[PDB]
Amino acid sequence: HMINYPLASSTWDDLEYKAIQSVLDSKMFTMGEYVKQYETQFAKTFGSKYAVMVSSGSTANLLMIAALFFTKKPRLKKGDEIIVPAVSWSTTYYPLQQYGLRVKFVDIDINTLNIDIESLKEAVTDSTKAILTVNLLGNPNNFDEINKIIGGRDIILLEDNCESMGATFNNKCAGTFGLMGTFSSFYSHHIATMEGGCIVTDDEEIYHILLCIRAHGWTRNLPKKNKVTGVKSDDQFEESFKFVLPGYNVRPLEMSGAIGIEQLKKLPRFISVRRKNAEYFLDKFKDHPYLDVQQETGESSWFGFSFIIKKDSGVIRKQLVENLNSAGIECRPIVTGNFLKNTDVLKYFDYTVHNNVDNAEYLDKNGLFVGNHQIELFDEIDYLREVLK
Amino acid sequence: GHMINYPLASSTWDDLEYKAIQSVLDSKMFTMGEYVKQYETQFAKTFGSKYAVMVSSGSTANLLMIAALFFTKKPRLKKGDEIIVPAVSWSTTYYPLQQYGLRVKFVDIDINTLNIDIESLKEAVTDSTKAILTVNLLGNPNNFDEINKIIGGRDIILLEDNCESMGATFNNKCAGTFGLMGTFSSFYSHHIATMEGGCIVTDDEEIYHILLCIRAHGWTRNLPKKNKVTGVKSDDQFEESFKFVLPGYNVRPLEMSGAIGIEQLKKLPRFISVRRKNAEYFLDKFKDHPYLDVQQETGESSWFGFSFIIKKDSGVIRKQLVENLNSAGIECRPIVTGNFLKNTDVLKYFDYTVHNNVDNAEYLDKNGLFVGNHQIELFDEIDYLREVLK
Ligand SMILES: Cc1ncc(COP(=O)(O)O)c(C(O)O)c1O
Ligand SMILES: Cc1ncc(COP(=O)(O)O)c(C(O)O)c1O
Numbered sequence: 025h026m027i028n029y030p031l032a033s034s035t036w037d038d039l040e041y042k043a044i045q046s047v048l049d050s051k052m053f054t055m056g057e058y059v060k061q062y063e064t065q066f067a068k069t070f071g072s073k074y075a076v077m078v079s080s081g082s083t084a085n086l087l088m089i090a091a092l093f094f095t096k097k098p099r100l101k102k103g104d105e106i107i108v109p110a111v112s113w114s115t116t117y118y119p120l121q122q123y124g125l126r127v128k129f130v131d132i133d134i135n136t137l138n139i140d141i142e143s144l145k146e147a148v149t150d151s152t153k154a155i156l157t158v159n160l161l162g163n164p165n166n167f168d169e170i171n172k173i174i175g176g177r178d179i180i181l182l183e184d185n186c187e188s189m190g191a192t193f194n195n196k197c198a199g200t201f202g203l204m205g206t207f208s209s210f211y212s213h214h215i216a217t218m219e220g221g222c223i224v225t226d227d228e229e230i231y232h233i234l235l236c237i238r239a240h241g242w243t244r245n246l247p248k249k250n251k252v253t254g255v256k257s258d259d260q261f262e263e264s265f266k267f268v269l270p271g272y273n274v275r276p277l278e279m280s281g282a283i284g285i286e287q288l289k290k291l292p293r294f295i296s297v298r299r300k301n302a303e304y305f306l307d308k309f310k311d312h313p314y315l316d317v318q319q320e321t322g323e324s325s326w327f328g329f330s331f332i333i334k335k336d337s338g339v340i341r342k343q344l345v346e347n348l349n350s351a352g353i354e355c356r357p358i359v360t361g362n363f364l365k366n367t368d369v370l371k372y373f374d375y376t377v378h379n380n381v382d383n384a385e386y387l388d389k390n391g392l393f394v395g396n397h398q399i400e401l402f403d404e405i406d407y408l409r410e411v412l413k
Numbered sequence: 414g415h416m417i418n419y420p421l422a423s424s425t426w427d428d429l430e431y432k433a434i435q436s437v438l439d440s441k442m443f444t445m446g447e448y449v450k451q452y453e454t455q456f457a458k459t460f461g462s463k464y465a466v467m468v469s470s471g472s473t474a475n476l477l478m479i480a481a482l483f484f485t486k487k488p489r490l491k492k493g494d495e496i497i498v499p500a501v502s503w504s505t506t507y508y509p510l511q512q513y514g515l516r517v518k519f520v521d522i523d524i525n526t527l528n529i530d531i532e533s534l535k536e537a538v539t540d541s542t543k544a545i546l547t548v549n550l551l552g553n554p555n556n557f558d559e560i561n562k563i564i565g566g567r568d569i570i571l572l573e574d575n576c577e578s579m580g581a582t583f584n585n586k587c588a589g590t591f592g593l594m595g596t597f598s599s600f601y602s603h604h605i606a607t608m609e610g611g612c613i614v615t616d617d618e619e620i621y622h623i624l625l626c627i628r629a630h631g632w633t634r635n636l637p638k639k640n641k642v643t644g645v646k647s648d649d650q651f652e653e654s655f656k657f658v659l660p661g662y663n664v665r666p667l668e669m670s671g672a673i674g675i676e677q678l679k680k681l682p683r684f685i686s687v688r689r690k691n692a693e694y695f696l697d698k699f700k701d702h703p704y705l706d707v708q709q710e711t712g713e714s715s716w717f718g719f720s721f722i723i724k725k726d727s728g729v730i731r732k733q734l735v736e737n738l739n740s741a742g743i744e745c746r747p748i749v750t751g752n753f754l755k756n757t758d759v760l761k762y763f764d765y766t767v768h769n770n771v772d773n774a775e776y777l778d779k780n781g782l783f784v785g786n787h788q789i790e791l792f793d794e795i796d797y798l799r800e801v802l803k
């Protein structure tokens with residue numbers, strides 16, 4: 025089928041192409057100046073003390089988890105219990121498996137698409153070591169409630185903010201609530217640097233650990249006085265060749281950093297347009313006869329538009345999809361649907377399901393999603409509405 | 414702004430690579446795609462392997478190489494399994510082993526070749542040994558014929574970290590193709606450079622498909638309809654496109670890297686030729702050095718760079734040589750990381766053992782150094798080097 029209303033689009037203009045050119049002219053392609061400047065603007069934009077740019081949102085999630093094992097007083101141990109929602113991207117879960125964590129799956133709230141608060145209440149026990157929240161499709165989690173659950177205990181809160189860059193809750197930026205928050209700059213995300221991801225944090229030790237684990241486990245990117253090795257020697261013959269933590273090579277490219285700088289400047293505008301489209305969309309689908317929309321928490325950055333076929337509406341997903349496609353509208357499942365359906369990969373995990381994941385299953389069979397862009401889509405929205413009659 | 418008479422590194426690019434970048438820009442398709450696929454094809458063809466998988470770095474190539482072994486239908490490796498490694502290599506040759514819960518057995522190197530000591534290897538191999546991860550150091554291949562005699566038909570997996578020896582050959586066979594898998598790096602200043610980049614080669618189809626899956630989200634999108642991981646892919650796109658079967662990563666390379674890579678491979682043969690011609694000259698000048706030993710060549714090395722080990726009982730202090738090189742405008746480095754076993758802090762995380770001792774690695778650690786080799790003639794530079802190292 026020929027597609028006229030696509031999920032994705034370009035966020036770039038001449039500015040980004042000019043930024044690539046500068047990099048080319050510099051003849052310095054390895055992670056450097058631009059990446060650093062990008063990191064600095066990144067932390068500033070979102071209201072976090074530190075930011076570390078990585079190769080992808082997936083590698084951001086990887087470093088996020090790994091980091092916890094390397095604190096002077098390790099924050100995590102093999103076998104520790106971590107709670108996650110049943111709907112998210114695959115790379116939200118893999119690192120948990122890769123680090124030998126015990127995973128506890130919690131159902132989602134069918135209206136918000138986020139972790140079900142009532143379920144979470146019950147799922148958290150004395151054994152819960154961390155909670156890994158995911159801000160789905162631009163919609164932030166209700167952190168106030170989440171915080172009420174933790175009730176001051178020593179439970180780490182983490183956020184995969186790969187789909188909700190720019191969302192806010194209580195006037196605070198999503199991604200900044202947790203000990204760490206991850207973002208993604210892959211093609212067609214709120215911003216795009218070809219490939220790219222970021223980790224934000226306010227913790228200095230964690231920040232130093234990240235700088236180390238991102239590139240070979242060395243000390244080259246650490247300050248003379250750092251929280252990992254304390255004080256770096258002055259003998260570079262020695263110093264430059266020391267390895268202290270079991271890391272990776274997940275450095276981003278300088279180009280991505282330079283592009284990111286341009287993208288960040290435009291973010292306020294992107295969020296604005298996306299939010300205006302959302303408004304229009306909600307108005308148009310307000311009392312839809314057989315489709316429910318996502319219920320907003322705080323100020324969502326509306327990554328895209330989800331629809332859930334109403335219970336006993338007798339509407340069949342398959343037809344809708346055909347219908348949309350035939351109409352030139354691109355569509356997809358809501359992320360990966362119920363992650364628990366992936367039995368082959370789950371064989372590798374040490375996990376458990378809290379209660380049931382009835383909502384996740386429902387969504388899995390009755391949900392779908394269409395794109396939202398940083399471009400006015402009023403016409404596309406009128407048409408979509410027309411098609412979904 | 415360096416004021417350097419003899420640099421460790423240099424750029425390998427010309428107008429061709431720049432043109433290649435322009436071409437991707439124009440296409441507006443930045444995510445791994447056609448260029449990466451062409452590159453992989455050319456890559457496999459160039460070294461004589463059936464398959465090639467481009468990754469974000471040589472470090473992630475290594476990672477996936479180890480990871481793939483846990484995912485074969487009949488797992489090739491399991492937690493606690495013993496893997497042998499030489500004591501001198503890059504840090505990322507080691508980490509994946511740790512990350513996968515393997516038991517690491519460090520073996521000393523040969524002080525002449527700088528590769529794993531064959532005699533010690535003989536003694537190091539037991540019935541518990543499940544795999545041997547060889548490293549072709551500084552362009553120099555391992556003697557696979559001897560290694561092959563050591564495995565002696567037992568069921569031990571041979572692997573290769575070929576991140577420094579792209580283009581080396583042994584008995585008419587390309588380094589990186591000897592083991593079940595071989596890794597390469599296209600990072601700045603390697604034989605070829607694509608900003609950042611890595612590759613895995615293999616002749617095993619099942620492994621190839623496992624690699625395609627774990628490189629990108631553990632999904633099925635990059636797998637053939639009929640493949641070794643899932644057998645046969647559904648036609649239902651809303652369904653098949655969002656299915657995750659293996660615990661992987663996102664280590665894809667950028668489409669730009671593949672485009673640049675295509676140009677570099679063309680030049681590769683010339684690069685190797687120039688490096689070998691520099692080496693022939695270097696060797697002639699240093700073969701009889703009074704206090705420095707050079708790398709003993711095995712097969713046809715690709716001479717990544719030039720190593721030096723101070724002769725025993727020479728009365729020459731490394732620190733002095735370095736100082737001398739530096740004032741002379743000659744960049745020098747330790748040999749790779751030197752003795753990896755000296756990194757006690759990081760070792761704490763490992764489940765390892767040392768076979769016998771690492772006396773050679775310790776010697777090299779304290780008495781070795783390296784200067785660069787490039788794809789440009791260095792006659793004058795070598796002459797100067799010899800003058801400085803009087
Ligand atoms: C929730 C989530 N986490 C991680 C993810 C990955 O980021 P990268 O695509 O940049 O690896 C993604 C992305 O959208 O696929 C995601 O949605
Ligand atoms: C032996 C070895 N393995 C892996 C390595 C890493 O490749 P990347 O730097 O592309 O991650 C390297 C590289 O030279 O640092 C290396 O030497």
Ligand SMILES: [Mg+2]
Pocket residue numbers: 790791792793
């Ligand atoms: Mg000359």
